[PDB]
Design a protein that fits this description.
- Keywords: Cell outer membrane, Lipoprotein, Membrane, Palmitate, Signal.
- Its main location: membrane.
- Belongs to the OspA lipoprotein family.
- One of its GO terms (cellular component) is cell outer membrane.
- A hairpin with a 7-residue loop joins strand 11 and strand 12 (129-134).
- This protein is mostly beta strands.
- It folds into two domains: 1-100, Lipocalin; 101-246, Outer Surface Protein A, domain 3.
- The radius of gyration is 24 Å and the shape is elongated.
- It contains one helix and 21 strands.
- The strands form three sheets. It has a twelve-stranded antiparallel sheet with strand order 5-6-7-8-9-10-11-12-13-14-15-16, with helices on one face. The chain has a five-stranded antiparallel sheet with strand order 17-18-19-20-21, with no helix packed on it. It has a four-stranded antiparallel sheet with strand order 1-2-3-4, with no helix packed on it.
Length: 246
């Protein structure tokens, strides 16, 4: 009789209660109606399982020694070139990767623990491509390079650019082609608090905070332009970002 073990990525594996003559444990899993099997020198459910799709595609499930990570891979029928790879980390973040005929990354969708997503599509050999960030209530669009993701919001002559570096570091910038010194928006980015401060006509007007919970809040300054007033408001739709840029 086997032991059921819960896995990252909404999966289950059955591990034999005792080992075999080689001291190895049998593993069984069913992943979307596909039966996988394998053998492990651990007893906790970790190890490697394999199977074959109806179309002859090879399938391999790798479970990390501590049960923290699962990797679900599909290959071409000879097992040589990757087709897709789904990795759930111990922080429960999900990486969903598609590969081209040559087994090179052509698409990656990152699902964060809070369910927000970074969608990279049309990925080329220089790592460039199209990018989208799916937040709660709205979506941000831009491009990917080997250096950074850049998501853009335009409103009038103001262009707001959210940069995510290859390391995951966020920085935000604002450029206005308005040349009237009365209404032109400019902005300073405080990397330490993840806050962009917008200024018009030498007065601070609002703080946009790009939070660690993957939200944006807006808070106004008083008419003096010196101190914040009220309390920050969480953006819930793309139109409210645009309004903050007016």
């Amino acid at each position: 009789n086997s032991v059921s073990v819960d896995l990252p990525g909404s999966m289950k594996v059955l591990v034999s209660k005792s080992s075999n003559a080689d001291g190895k444990y049998d593993l069984i899993a069913t992943v979307d109606a596909l039966e996988l099997s394998g053998t492990s020198d651990k007893n906790n459910g970790s190890g490697v399982l394999e199977g074959v799709k109806a179309d002859a595609s090879k399938v391999k499930l790798t479970i990390s020694d501590d049960l923290g990570q699962t990797t679900l891979e599909v290959f071409k029928s000879d097992g040589s070139t990757l087709v897709s790879k789904k990795v759930t980390s111990k922080d429960k973040v999900l990486g969903d990767v598609k590969f081209n005929e040559k087994g090179e990354v052509s698409e990656k969708i990152i699902t964060r623990a809070d369910g927000t997503r970074l969608e990279y599509t049309g990925i080329k050999s220089d790592g460039s491509g199209k990018a989208k960030e799916v937040l709660k209530g709205y979506v941000l669009e831009g491009t990917l390079t080997a250096e950074k993701t850049t998501l853009v919001v335009k409103e009038g002559t103001v262009t707001l650019s959210k940069n995510i570096s290859k390391s995951g570091a966020v920085s935000v910038e604002l450029n206005d082609t308005d040349s009237s010194a009365a209404t032109k928006k400019t902005a300073a980015w405080n990397s330490g608090t993840s806050t962009l401060t917008i200024t018009v006509n030498s007065k601070k007007t609002k703080d946009l905070v790009f939070t660690s919970s993957n939200t944006i809040t807006v808070q106004q300054y008083d008419s003096n332009g010196t101190s914040l007033e009220g309390s920050a408001v969480e953006i819930t739709k793309l139109d409210e970002i645009k309004n903050a840029l007016k």
